[PDB]
Amino acid sequence: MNDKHPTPDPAEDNAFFPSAYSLSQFTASKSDLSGAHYPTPYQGGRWKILVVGADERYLMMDNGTFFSTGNHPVATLLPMYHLDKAGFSFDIATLSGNPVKFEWWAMPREDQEVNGLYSKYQSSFRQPLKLSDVIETALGEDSDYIGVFIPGGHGALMGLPDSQEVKAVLQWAMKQNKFIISLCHGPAAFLAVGDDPLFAGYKIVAFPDEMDAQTPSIGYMPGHLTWKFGEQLQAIGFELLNTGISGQVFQDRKMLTGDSPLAGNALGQLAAKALLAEVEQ
């Protein structure tokens, strides 16, 4: 619990889990999952939510090391928990169709409810749909998706930020006025729109670029990020509301964002209310 050295990841050459010290600062055995009780669920049985997960665990640092990352299970499973409880189902997809990669070192191992939720969706995480197939026949005007979920963790920084398929999903989302839900580094995916000013003026919270700049000092990552998603989002007309993290969330129209994995629970409450209130419109 003292060591600040990146912990070697045995499965991959020159790849590192977060240091023992960082892990003891940024992870816990149980989540702060709460308030996930909705007396008036959605029972319509139509509306699903599209989950776009990270297919890659190893993120290339500026110093040549791999950060052993993925989707952060708290940023992922907690919003999914509230929405599952609120009545909604999920399809899970990655860009390649390869298994969704979690930061299992951030999993709360003593959390029955979260462990429960993961297990309910484990077959889908372990063998997800391929996004290109989802995009073919599952979107359009007649889509059964009421929203898109793009979970966080640094794993979101790979593939998603310039996938032309994430682009099609975001354009669909906006065109059909659907919910877009994301947190932490998830919003890096909104960069897939390229030079489409689709998002101009939108207000979001996200993980601060500045925090990413400091966490390698406690060995959380084995190097620094090769680029800064916050400023680049800023460059496409996004207003970033937050310089720090408090696990807060914000909704601008149908854009729902959380500042960090800590925003996990809150995002779930915010999204649940928004979606429940709209299938009762």
mmCIF file of C-alpha atoms in Angstrom:
data_model
loop_
_atom_site.group_PDB
_atom_site.id
_atom_site.type_symbol
_atom_site.label_atom_id
_atom_site.label_comp_id
_atom_site.label_asym_id
_atom_site.label_seq_id
_atom_site.Cartn_x
_atom_site.Cartn_y
_atom_site.Cartn_z
ATOM 1 C CA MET A 1 0.000 0.000 0.000
ATOM 2 C CA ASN A 2 3.110 2.204 -0.027
ATOM 3 C CA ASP A 3 4.852 1.354 -3.272
ATOM 4 C CA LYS A 4 4.433 3.986 -5.990
ATOM 5 C CA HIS A 5 6.107 1.932 -8.737
ATOM 6 C CA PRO A 6 3.928 0.808 -11.662
ATOM 7 C CA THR A 7 3.001 -2.802 -11.011
ATOM 8 C CA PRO A 8 4.057 -5.093 -13.864
ATOM 9 C CA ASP A 9 1.227 -6.639 -15.892
ATOM 10 C CA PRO A 10 2.288 -10.291 -16.507
ATOM 11 C CA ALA A 11 0.190 -10.852 -19.648
ATOM 12 C CA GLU A 12 1.925 -8.168 -21.718
ATOM 13 C CA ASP A 13 5.515 -7.016 -22.336
ATOM 14 C CA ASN A 14 6.422 -3.677 -20.712
ATOM 15 C CA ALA A 15 2.899 -3.073 -19.499
ATOM 16 C CA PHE A 16 1.892 -1.843 -16.081
ATOM 17 C CA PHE A 17 -1.074 -1.934 -13.745
ATOM 18 C CA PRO A 18 -1.410 1.108 -11.458
ATOM 19 C CA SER A 19 1.045 1.251 -8.535
ATOM 20 C CA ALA A 20 0.057 -0.252 -5.184
ATOM 21 C CA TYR A 21 -0.105 3.276 -3.744
ATOM 22 C CA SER A 22 -2.346 4.728 -6.443
ATOM 23 C CA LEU A 23 -4.611 1.666 -6.292
ATOM 24 C CA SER A 24 -5.072 2.241 -2.572
ATOM 25 C CA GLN A 25 -5.989 5.874 -3.342
ATOM 26 C CA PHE A 26 -8.248 5.395 -6.382
ATOM 27 C CA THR A 27 -9.899 2.025 -5.703
ATOM 28 C CA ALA A 28 -12.001 0.378 -3.008
ATOM 29 C CA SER A 29 -13.470 -3.062 -2.257
ATOM 30 C CA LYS A 30 -17.035 -1.712 -2.528
ATOM 31 C CA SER A 31 -18.671 0.953 -4.682
ATOM 32 C CA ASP A 32 -20.791 3.856 -3.530
ATOM 33 C CA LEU A 33 -23.729 2.459 -5.474
ATOM 34 C CA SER A 34 -26.881 3.922 -3.888
ATOM 35 C CA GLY A 35 -30.405 5.224 -4.488
ATOM 36 C CA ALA A 36 -30.879 2.635 -7.237
ATOM 37 C CA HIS A 37 -34.481 1.928 -6.265
ATOM 38 C CA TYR A 38 -37.130 2.943 -8.794
ATOM 39 C CA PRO A 39 -40.735 2.192 -7.807
ATOM 40 C CA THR A 40 -41.963 2.997 -11.308
ATOM 41 C CA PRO A 41 -39.650 1.121 -13.708
ATOM 42 C CA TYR A 42 -39.878 0.931 -17.467
ATOM 43 C CA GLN A 43 -41.700 -2.253 -18.397
ATOM 44 C CA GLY A 44 -42.294 -1.441 -22.049
ATOM 45 C CA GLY A 45 -39.633 -4.020 -22.882
ATOM 46 C CA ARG A 46 -38.615 -2.254 -26.096
ATOM 47 C CA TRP A 47 -36.042 0.383 -25.176
ATOM 48 C CA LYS A 48 -32.464 -0.779 -24.889
ATOM 49 C CA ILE A 49 -29.285 1.157 -24.458
ATOM 50 C CA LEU A 50 -26.287 0.740 -26.729
ATOM 51 C CA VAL A 51 -23.063 0.286 -24.781
ATOM 52 C CA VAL A 52 -19.882 1.030 -26.703
ATOM 53 C CA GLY A 53 -17.047 -0.582 -24.728
ATOM 54 C CA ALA A 54 -13.257 -0.463 -25.057
ATOM 55 C CA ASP A 55 -11.772 -3.444 -26.903
ATOM 56 C CA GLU A 56 -8.163 -2.610 -25.944
ATOM 57 C CA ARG A 57 -6.496 -2.828 -22.525
ATOM 58 C CA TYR A 58 -3.020 -1.552 -23.376
ATOM 59 C CA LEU A 59 -2.613 2.171 -23.863
ATOM 60 C CA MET A 60 0.707 3.406 -25.231
ATOM 61 C CA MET A 61 2.325 5.965 -22.919
ATOM 62 C CA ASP A 62 4.661 8.741 -24.076
ATOM 63 C CA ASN A 63 7.647 6.833 -22.654
ATOM 64 C CA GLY A 64 6.937 3.594 -24.525
ATOM 65 C CA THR A 65 5.276 1.694 -21.686
ATOM 66 C CA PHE A 66 1.747 0.297 -21.855
ATOM 67 C CA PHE A 67 -0.669 1.456 -19.239
ATOM 68 C CA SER A 68 -2.788 -1.603 -18.443
ATOM 69 C CA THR A 69 -6.170 0.066 -18.612
ATOM 70 C CA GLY A 70 -9.549 -0.607 -20.211
ATOM 71 C CA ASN A 71 -13.028 0.520 -19.187
ATOM 72 C CA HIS A 72 -13.269 1.492 -15.519
ATOM 73 C CA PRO A 73 -15.763 -0.979 -13.935
ATOM 74 C CA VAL A 74 -17.158 1.649 -11.547
ATOM 75 C CA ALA A 75 -17.669 4.209 -14.341
ATOM 76 C CA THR A 76 -19.230 1.380 -16.371
ATOM 77 C CA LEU A 77 -21.273 -0.839 -14.085
ATOM 78 C CA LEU A 78 -22.783 1.798 -11.796
ATOM 79 C CA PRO A 79 -24.593 3.727 -14.503
ATOM 80 C CA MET A 80 -25.625 0.361 -15.958
ATOM 81 C CA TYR A 81 -26.879 -0.675 -12.541
ATOM 82 C CA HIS A 82 -29.350 2.189 -12.177
ATOM 83 C CA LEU A 83 -30.649 1.869 -15.727
ATOM 84 C CA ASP A 84 -31.036 -1.889 -15.300
ATOM 85 C CA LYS A 85 -33.010 -1.258 -12.146
ATOM 86 C CA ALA A 86 -35.010 1.477 -13.881
ATOM 87 C CA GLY A 87 -36.231 -1.034 -16.464
ATOM 88 C CA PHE A 88 -33.771 -0.835 -19.375
ATOM 89 C CA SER A 89 -31.764 -3.560 -21.136
ATOM 90 C CA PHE A 90 -28.371 -3.444 -22.852
ATOM 91 C CA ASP A 91 -26.623 -4.429 -26.006
ATOM 92 C CA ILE A 92 -22.863 -4.400 -25.608
ATOM 93 C CA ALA A 93 -20.545 -3.657 -28.521
ATOM 94 C CA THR A 94 -16.930 -2.924 -29.313
ATOM 95 C CA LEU A 95 -15.342 -1.680 -32.521
ATOM 96 C CA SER A 96 -13.593 -4.983 -33.385
ATOM 97 C CA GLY A 97 -16.062 -7.319 -31.708
ATOM 98 C CA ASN A 98 -13.242 -8.345 -29.380
ATOM 99 C CA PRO A 99 -14.078 -8.718 -25.657
ATOM 100 C CA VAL A 100 -14.674 -5.506 -23.674
ATOM 101 C CA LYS A 101 -11.570 -4.820 -21.552
ATOM 102 C CA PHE A 102 -12.047 -3.837 -17.892
ATOM 103 C CA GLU A 103 -9.624 -2.307 -15.439
ATOM 104 C CA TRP A 104 -10.166 -5.286 -13.158
ATOM 105 C CA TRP A 105 -7.785 -3.712 -10.678
ATOM 106 C CA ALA A 106 -10.527 -1.116 -10.025
ATOM 107 C CA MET A 107 -13.271 -3.691 -9.558
ATOM 108 C CA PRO A 108 -14.871 -3.607 -6.104
ATOM 109 C CA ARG A 109 -14.447 -7.287 -5.147
ATOM 110 C CA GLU A 110 -16.744 -7.153 -2.144
ATOM 111 C CA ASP A 111 -19.637 -5.462 -3.899
ATOM 112 C CA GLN A 112 -22.378 -8.069 -4.264
ATOM 113 C CA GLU A 113 -24.684 -5.840 -6.299
ATOM 114 C CA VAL A 114 -22.005 -4.716 -8.785
ATOM 115 C CA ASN A 115 -20.564 -8.222 -8.978
ATOM 116 C CA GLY A 116 -24.148 -9.299 -9.555
ATOM 117 C CA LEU A 117 -24.692 -6.865 -12.401
ATOM 118 C CA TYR A 118 -21.476 -7.768 -14.134
ATOM 119 C CA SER A 119 -22.381 -11.455 -13.939
ATOM 120 C CA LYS A 120 -25.763 -10.779 -15.490
ATOM 121 C CA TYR A 121 -24.008 -9.146 -18.439
ATOM 122 C CA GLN A 122 -20.777 -11.087 -18.387
ATOM 123 C CA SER A 123 -21.535 -13.139 -21.513
ATOM 124 C CA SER A 124 -22.149 -9.901 -23.383
ATOM 125 C CA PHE A 125 -18.968 -8.195 -22.083
ATOM 126 C CA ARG A 126 -16.835 -11.276 -22.801
ATOM 127 C CA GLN A 127 -18.251 -11.700 -26.295
ATOM 128 C CA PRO A 128 -19.811 -8.403 -27.383
ATOM 129 C CA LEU A 129 -21.482 -7.441 -30.615
ATOM 130 C CA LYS A 130 -19.459 -5.823 -33.360
ATOM 131 C CA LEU A 131 -20.486 -2.164 -33.703
ATOM 132 C CA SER A 132 -20.502 -2.220 -37.499
ATOM 133 C CA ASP A 133 -23.274 -4.847 -37.410
ATOM 134 C CA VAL A 134 -25.241 -2.833 -34.858
ATOM 135 C CA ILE A 135 -24.853 0.235 -37.070
ATOM 136 C CA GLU A 136 -26.161 -1.647 -40.105
ATOM 137 C CA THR A 137 -29.668 -2.547 -38.979
ATOM 138 C CA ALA A 138 -30.106 -1.431 -35.367
ATOM 139 C CA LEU A 139 -30.103 2.362 -35.674
ATOM 140 C CA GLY A 140 -32.127 4.513 -38.102
ATOM 141 C CA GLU A 141 -35.550 6.043 -37.340
ATOM 142 C CA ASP A 142 -37.017 2.762 -36.090
ATOM 143 C CA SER A 143 -34.205 1.969 -33.633
ATOM 144 C CA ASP A 144 -35.003 0.294 -30.348
ATOM 145 C CA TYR A 145 -32.169 2.205 -28.688
ATOM 146 C CA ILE A 146 -33.279 5.100 -26.506
ATOM 147 C CA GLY A 147 -29.688 6.166 -25.928
ATOM 148 C CA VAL A 148 -25.991 5.463 -26.249
ATOM 149 C CA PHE A 149 -23.675 4.678 -23.357
ATOM 150 C CA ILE A 150 -19.934 5.208 -23.680
ATOM 151 C CA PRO A 151 -18.340 4.154 -20.341
ATOM 152 C CA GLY A 152 -15.046 5.646 -19.150
ATOM 153 C CA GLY A 153 -11.587 4.541 -18.121
ATOM 154 C CA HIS A 154 -8.551 5.351 -20.249
ATOM 155 C CA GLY A 155 -9.517 2.404 -22.444
ATOM 156 C CA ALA A 156 -12.001 4.856 -24.058
ATOM 157 C CA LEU A 157 -9.039 6.813 -25.439
ATOM 158 C CA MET A 158 -8.369 4.024 -27.960
ATOM 159 C CA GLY A 159 -10.243 3.359 -31.188
ATOM 160 C CA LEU A 160 -13.323 5.324 -30.212
ATOM 161 C CA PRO A 161 -11.970 8.893 -30.607
ATOM 162 C CA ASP A 162 -11.620 8.487 -34.386
ATOM 163 C CA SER A 163 -13.845 5.573 -35.358
ATOM 164 C CA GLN A 164 -16.089 6.595 -38.276
ATOM 165 C CA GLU A 165 -18.597 4.160 -36.797
ATOM 166 C CA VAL A 166 -18.610 5.956 -33.469
ATOM 167 C CA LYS A 167 -19.190 8.969 -35.685
ATOM 168 C CA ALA A 168 -22.265 7.370 -37.256
ATOM 169 C CA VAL A 169 -23.576 6.458 -33.810
ATOM 170 C CA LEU A 170 -23.146 10.034 -32.536
ATOM 171 C CA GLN A 171 -24.737 11.547 -35.660
ATOM 172 C CA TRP A 172 -27.619 9.059 -35.364
ATOM 173 C CA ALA A 173 -27.928 9.978 -31.675
ATOM 174 C CA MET A 174 -28.168 13.719 -32.404
ATOM 175 C CA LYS A 175 -30.303 13.364 -35.570
ATOM 176 C CA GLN A 176 -32.875 11.134 -33.848
ATOM 177 C CA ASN A 177 -32.565 13.131 -30.614
ATOM 178 C CA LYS A 178 -31.413 10.234 -28.471
ATOM 179 C CA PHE A 179 -29.623 10.146 -25.149
ATOM 180 C CA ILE A 180 -25.821 10.230 -25.187
ATOM 181 C CA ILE A 181 -24.363 9.166 -21.854
ATOM 182 C CA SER A 182 -20.674 9.135 -20.973
ATOM 183 C CA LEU A 183 -18.211 9.915 -18.170
ATOM 184 C CA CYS A 184 -14.539 10.108 -17.252
ATOM 185 C CA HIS A 185 -12.608 9.677 -20.522
ATOM 186 C CA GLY A 186 -15.631 8.345 -22.366
ATOM 187 C CA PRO A 187 -16.228 11.834 -23.886
ATOM 188 C CA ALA A 188 -13.002 11.357 -25.881
ATOM 189 C CA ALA A 189 -15.283 9.342 -28.147
ATOM 190 C CA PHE A 190 -17.234 12.480 -29.125
ATOM 191 C CA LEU A 191 -14.063 13.353 -31.042
ATOM 192 C CA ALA A 192 -15.071 10.796 -33.683
ATOM 193 C CA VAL A 193 -17.228 13.502 -35.307
ATOM 194 C CA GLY A 194 -14.066 15.022 -36.758
ATOM 195 C CA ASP A 195 -14.799 18.495 -38.113
ATOM 196 C CA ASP A 196 -18.576 18.275 -37.901
ATOM 197 C CA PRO A 197 -19.573 21.186 -35.583
ATOM 198 C CA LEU A 198 -22.396 18.899 -34.416
ATOM 199 C CA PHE A 199 -21.604 19.508 -30.770
ATOM 200 C CA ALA A 200 -20.868 23.253 -30.722
ATOM 201 C CA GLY A 201 -21.877 24.925 -27.463
ATOM 202 C CA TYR A 202 -22.618 21.657 -25.666
ATOM 203 C CA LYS A 203 -21.627 21.664 -21.987
ATOM 204 C CA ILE A 204 -20.058 18.544 -20.529
ATOM 205 C CA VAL A 205 -17.994 17.513 -17.583
ATOM 206 C CA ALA A 206 -15.102 15.115 -18.201
ATOM 207 C CA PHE A 207 -11.854 13.990 -16.604
ATOM 208 C CA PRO A 208 -9.532 17.006 -16.439
ATOM 209 C CA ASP A 209 -6.481 16.962 -18.710
ATOM 210 C CA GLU A 210 -4.602 18.449 -15.771
ATOM 211 C CA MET A 211 -5.362 15.496 -13.501
ATOM 212 C CA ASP A 212 -4.107 13.089 -16.169
ATOM 213 C CA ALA A 213 -0.942 15.179 -16.024
ATOM 214 C CA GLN A 214 -0.395 14.560 -12.293
ATOM 215 C CA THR A 215 -1.370 10.937 -11.682
ATOM 216 C CA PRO A 216 1.781 9.369 -13.168
ATOM 217 C CA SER A 217 3.673 10.939 -10.251
ATOM 218 C CA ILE A 218 2.041 8.409 -7.894
ATOM 219 C CA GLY A 219 2.579 5.665 -10.447
ATOM 220 C CA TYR A 220 -1.108 5.450 -11.434
ATOM 221 C CA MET A 221 0.027 5.239 -15.091
ATOM 222 C CA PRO A 222 3.595 4.168 -16.073
ATOM 223 C CA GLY A 223 3.989 7.283 -18.245
ATOM 224 C CA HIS A 224 2.112 10.330 -19.528
ATOM 225 C CA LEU A 225 -0.644 10.465 -22.166
ATOM 226 C CA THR A 226 0.470 11.120 -25.709
ATOM 227 C CA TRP A 227 -2.371 13.608 -26.185
ATOM 228 C CA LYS A 228 -4.991 15.600 -24.287
ATOM 229 C CA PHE A 229 -8.626 14.737 -24.957
ATOM 230 C CA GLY A 230 -10.045 17.680 -22.921
ATOM 231 C CA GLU A 231 -8.440 20.459 -24.926
ATOM 232 C CA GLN A 232 -9.193 18.665 -28.202
ATOM 233 C CA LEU A 233 -12.861 18.426 -27.250
ATOM 234 C CA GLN A 234 -12.591 22.130 -26.363
ATOM 235 C CA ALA A 235 -11.370 22.662 -29.932
ATOM 236 C CA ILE A 236 -14.582 21.203 -31.355
ATOM 237 C CA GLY A 237 -16.891 23.573 -29.505
ATOM 238 C CA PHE A 238 -17.337 21.692 -26.239
ATOM 239 C CA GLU A 239 -17.479 23.798 -23.100
ATOM 240 C CA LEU A 240 -15.763 21.887 -20.278
ATOM 241 C CA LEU A 241 -17.470 22.789 -16.995
ATOM 242 C CA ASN A 242 -14.974 21.272 -14.575
ATOM 243 C CA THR A 243 -11.334 21.735 -13.549
ATOM 244 C CA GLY A 244 -11.566 19.172 -10.773
ATOM 245 C CA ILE A 245 -13.489 15.997 -9.966
ATOM 246 C CA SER A 246 -16.191 15.529 -7.369
ATOM 247 C CA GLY A 247 -18.120 12.788 -9.053
ATOM 248 C CA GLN A 248 -20.573 15.366 -10.354
ATOM 249 C CA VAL A 249 -22.653 15.027 -13.497
ATOM 250 C CA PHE A 250 -24.307 17.417 -15.940
ATOM 251 C CA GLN A 251 -27.108 17.180 -18.504
ATOM 252 C CA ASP A 252 -27.313 19.535 -21.451
ATOM 253 C CA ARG A 253 -30.386 18.516 -23.397
ATOM 254 C CA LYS A 254 -29.766 14.812 -24.002
ATOM 255 C CA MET A 255 -26.019 14.942 -23.394
ATOM 256 C CA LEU A 256 -25.361 13.381 -19.963
ATOM 257 C CA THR A 257 -21.775 13.371 -18.657
ATOM 258 C CA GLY A 258 -19.911 12.515 -15.465
ATOM 259 C CA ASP A 259 -16.615 13.993 -14.355
ATOM 260 C CA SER A 260 -14.794 10.782 -13.483
ATOM 261 C CA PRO A 261 -15.418 7.175 -12.369
ATOM 262 C CA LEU A 262 -16.540 8.682 -9.063
ATOM 263 C CA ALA A 263 -19.484 10.159 -11.012
ATOM 264 C CA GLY A 264 -20.588 6.550 -11.596
ATOM 265 C CA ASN A 265 -23.561 6.486 -9.209
ATOM 266 C CA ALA A 266 -24.699 10.022 -9.993
ATOM 267 C CA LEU A 267 -24.651 9.402 -13.737
ATOM 268 C CA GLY A 268 -26.865 6.411 -13.125
ATOM 269 C CA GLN A 269 -29.360 8.483 -11.124
ATOM 270 C CA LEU A 270 -29.316 11.306 -13.656
ATOM 271 C CA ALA A 271 -29.711 8.978 -16.636
ATOM 272 C CA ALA A 272 -32.350 6.818 -14.972
ATOM 273 C CA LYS A 273 -34.526 9.845 -14.198
ATOM 274 C CA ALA A 274 -34.122 11.282 -17.674
ATOM 275 C CA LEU A 275 -35.002 8.018 -19.422
ATOM 276 C CA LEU A 276 -37.800 7.063 -17.038
ATOM 277 C CA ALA A 277 -39.323 10.507 -17.421
ATOM 278 C CA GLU A 278 -39.304 10.165 -21.196
ATOM 279 C CA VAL A 279 -40.930 6.746 -21.567
ATOM 280 C CA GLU A 280 -43.667 8.536 -19.666
ATOM 281 C CA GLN A 281 -42.842 11.671 -21.715
#
